[model samples]
Target: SMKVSVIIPTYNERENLEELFSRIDNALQGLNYEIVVVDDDSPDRTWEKAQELSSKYPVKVIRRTKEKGLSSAVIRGFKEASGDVFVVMDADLQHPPEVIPKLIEAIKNGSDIAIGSRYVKGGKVENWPFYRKLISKGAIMVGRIALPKIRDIKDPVSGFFALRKEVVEGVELNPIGFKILMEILIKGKYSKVVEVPFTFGIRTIFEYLRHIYRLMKWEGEIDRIVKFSIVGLSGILVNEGFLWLFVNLGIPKEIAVIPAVELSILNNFFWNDIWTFKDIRRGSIFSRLLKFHIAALSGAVVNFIVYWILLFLGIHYLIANLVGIVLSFGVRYVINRHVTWAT
Candidate 1:
């Protein structure tokens, strides 16, 4: 019922382009579809191969040399694509062309968006090494925490997904790195989403490392950690000062500690909300504050427990407290970044 545009973003995929094009042509027999290849000017002449493929099939190739990134390439394809429904996939043959029809079928059957998933029932990985699998799974777990909207999705990182072009039309997409689908899912206007299982082929070392590099560079994780530590130090001073004031005023140490710690929690929440996670700030101020408090309290509990255990084991109280703060810092950063201010 709809014209489908299969947008395959490519870089150095010359080896797979011809066969992938043939498989796509064969898969959608009697169907109204077009293949748009957005290439980033691969040195291996992948764009040249795309042009040759175009003469033989319903294909359009857009090669760019100035701006280069998988996410940007797909968005370029989307701008040029003429279909009512758009499908995004990789050109390395990892995303099966045979599954194209199934994705189209899913959209026709009332799904606003259809994802080709590898972690769902009937989904699998073919010939992936143990390290690859570990990296893949670990990435998914971290992504889920950072992007909770994708928590229910088995493979939110999968590049193969189909959605009506209308879902993205007039919508501004500001995606970084390779996970354009994540940006679309978070920002697109859509209601119903369905997942279709598929076998993910093993990736080459180059492809694997590229993905890892993108993730590491995304959102400047190292810089964020440094800022988080600075804010944590401020909270520590506030906590110690309030504790000292309370104990000096004749209050019992144990009784004064909770409220003193609480003051520090409030101090941290305000600073972090304004600084550490400014980019991802969302929800009402009160709601964000409440979530921050909950996460902060959880971190405080971790700090308390670690300190108690280390002190009981004969470690110096000062050193034990430092260890406890170090441990709690990690807990707080993860929770705040993922939950408290999740964009």
Candidate 2:
């Protein structure tokens, strides 16, 4: 006897309400469910439209003229609706109503949250071009890189999803720039998550990048990365200082590089210990220091190769060097985050 609350955070999609409700009603035939339409007082006055339709269908309308935002609208729906299971979806008809059962069924089986995924196996989409696909997958890659815990999920950013009420009952969700489902997947208290394949709609590129950036920042990934970058900056100065001092002491410039690089590596590790991975300083100092060196030099090798290739491609030397530095920055940070203080 599960009571489901289908929360639709709507904008100006007033005309589609009847069809959406009819399709949803047909889709969930024998189920006990209520459609909660939390409208943000659209220019078309979709809130009034939803209120009009509420009498005929099991719909509840919350017309918030002050608060505006899709995620926040859904949050208000959660507060107003009384259901053990909560389903959140789009009102653009992008997320088909038919696929909702698969998500609900997954939740029935055992999953705490079930996502209607487009990237999972057997999932498909229409009208997506090559560039959009590339950007979509690339955005997911960046998200997985930044937030490793949800790496197992193929479509963590999916909008259409269902979750048990207990998963988010006490969780304080604040979706600043990240997508709603991304915030839930990261912060929701759940042990099991499942994905249901479905043919679906499209998404964006710039918005995806901004979302990941915000999630990374919120998860402290940005702080750790900024600290690592700062340490690298210090390491550069240390390397230059060591190189200058060694050359002045009559050491060959070529041979001076060896000690200079080694001392800088040592200097980077010291500061990184005090700041970057200070919270997650794993293993003994000796072992962690060695791993840090491994990632450092290996990343440097990548930097050298990229810089050389860019220079050979007739790019300005300084611009090529900057590109290499940017790429290597991620390379080294990835390794250090995963292997340096992974535990």
Candidate 3:
């Protein structure tokens, strides 16, 4: 049995498979590995070509009849894999097969995951337009902001990745979009992730844009909005909880609540800056705090407006308070994300 399962997930690439498979075979001729092709039952003759290639190559094709998703395809291959290490890559000539040896060398040198990144130090793309380059940089920017915990990566959204079989085993994967590598980085267990740079090549504008859109959705700042919203809601809870407690302890309602709200706002700013938007929050502590407090103050205005608007509409105080909370949270988020945090 092979030591690594090189999984290539594809759909509608009939013309590319033969040459790609041949290159893979030539590159890893004597290597202990098996090429697993998870085909999504393309309308073209892709599967037929894979079968023919398998006769002369260490390739096995799995044609999915019911389900269709690239991330899941790789995950299924992971489940059926018989190797100690598993890799997911594209079938197009984007990720060069010749780099396999370098990956093996890195693994031999003790790397857990090797990412074939086009944005890395020596990486580039062939026949790419200025906009295409922008899209790629834009994608990396989004990933950094959305998944701040995994920053310092050259390309966190790269689909070309390798990992140990045990790392992904029993790890729950909820594939939101085409960024399978992001899901793996967040959920899978691994250390010492490394990147290998390469020039990615592709055909047609439609395919490229389609891939770009799919990647942008999952790896964008919108993910940060969701995270910030959750954080803001928690802050509101802290605000209300302390306000209630202070009032119950015989403090004046108005005096007790304002200080409590400010206290909660500071708490939110600390975590949101240190954790949610670290990149944007970089600089002197006094400067960051000043900007964050200004943003929170603006949010408080929004909170009051929403509260009064809902009360004027004859809504219950609790329901009005919820409306206020959402409005205020959104206000704080936009200010911090764009101005204070500047992400």
Candidate 4:
């Protein structure tokens, strides 16, 4: 049997170590395998735990302190592990170690990649609520639409998967996001893939929104303007959300709109820093936040003036506000791009 390297990207997972190790060992009994534990120098000293367990288990611990990131840890583990079949997974116990056998078996049979899927037959998310399911499916749908290469796979965003070494040989993986598989699924030279279930899947909200934006940029599909505009769109949602909430909270629409605009500016700046000008961001977060306020306030002033005039003219308030926002988009974008995130 070809040797299997189980790469686990972990941080602050000390409590789950023994059980995870014991379960994985039991599941892979009589199989040729080694567990690669890549720790981000967890405060719980998870890497220390891995080191102690190495005395009894086939464990290799790479304690990373200088550089840290989730997807990057997986890549480091893959590079360090010496095995024909590379399996990347979580040590949080959510991803049952038992299903790893099927992933390996899938590879052995004919598939170049075998994914431990959470959206295939007999798959279920044990803890997620209804909206979480909607968000998960919604994100997957958007990902599929954006990247057609991985569209066929039901759970392209899953964290668990097995692959032959040759599949990634000479491949330059951009392991910087939550969905590293997006890089693999698109870049790998694999022709066949199999999905196995018992399968498991929470992911952060803004984290993947940023990732999808990055992916879009990677594939030459989006640019700074689009991302800035998307963030602006989210800002509108924030503005509207707070406006409605404030009005319902017994504030007059005029007074409420002021705070709403302020909150929207704050919301826009946060996203634009992380999403629009992320790579080129220069100043400290506080400085950038203040700069955005200064730049966005100008837009808000123009928006306010026009909005007030339109309201006095008896025009629909939302329509008036949107028109004002569109009118100010040019000014806001230029100032933020050149000054706030200036090189």
Candidate No. with top TM-score? 2
Estimate, for each residue in 1-343, the C-alpha lDDT of model 3 and write its tens digit: 4387889888887777878877877887787888888877788787788888878887778999877888788877887778787777888778878887777667667887888888888898778898978977876775554454456687887777777776788887764345678777766788888888877877434543454444435456566676777787788899999999999999999899888988887888777877778766666777778988998888779989889988999999999999887778766776776668643
lDDT of 2 by residue, 1-343 (tens): 9999999988788768878898899999889999998877788768878877778788988888888887787667778889899999988888999988888999999999999998899998778888987778777877777787777788888879999999888788874535888878777899999999998864266776777777678778888888888898898999999999999999999999999999999999999987888888877899989998998887889899999999899999999999998888888889888888785
Global lDDT scores for all candidate models: 0.83, 0.86, 0.77, 0.83
Residues 1-343, model 1: lDDT tens digits: 5788999888888878778888988998878889998887789777888888778888988888887888888889999999999999988888998998999899999998999998889988889888988888877776665445566777777789999998899987764445788767766889888999999975444554454444434536657778878887898999999999999999999999899888887898888888878878999989998998888878889999999999999999999999998889778878887778777
Q: How many backbone overlaps does candidate 4 show?
A: 0
Give TM per candidate: 0.70, 0.84, 0.66, 0.64
Q: TM-score for candidate 3, please give it.
A: 0.66
Candidate whose lDDT is highest: 2
- Cα lDDT tens digits for candidate 4, 194-270: 87887463328688878877776776546777888889889889999999999999999989999999899889888
Model 4 Cα displacement at 99 (Å)? 0.8
The parts of candidate 2 lying over 4 Å away from their true place are 175-178, 201-208, 233-251, 270-275, 278-291, 312-314
Comparing 2 with 3 on lDDT, the higher-scoring candidate is 2
Candidate 4 off by > 4 Å = 201-203, 220-343
Clashing pairs in 1: none
TM-score of 2: 0.84
User: How far in Å is the alpha carbon of 277 misplaced in model 4?
Assistant: 30
Q: Which is the winner by lDDT between candidate 1 and candidate 3?
A: 1
- lDDT, candidate 2, at 310: 93
Clash number for every model? 0, 0, 0, 0
**Cand. 4 Cα-lDDT:** 0.83
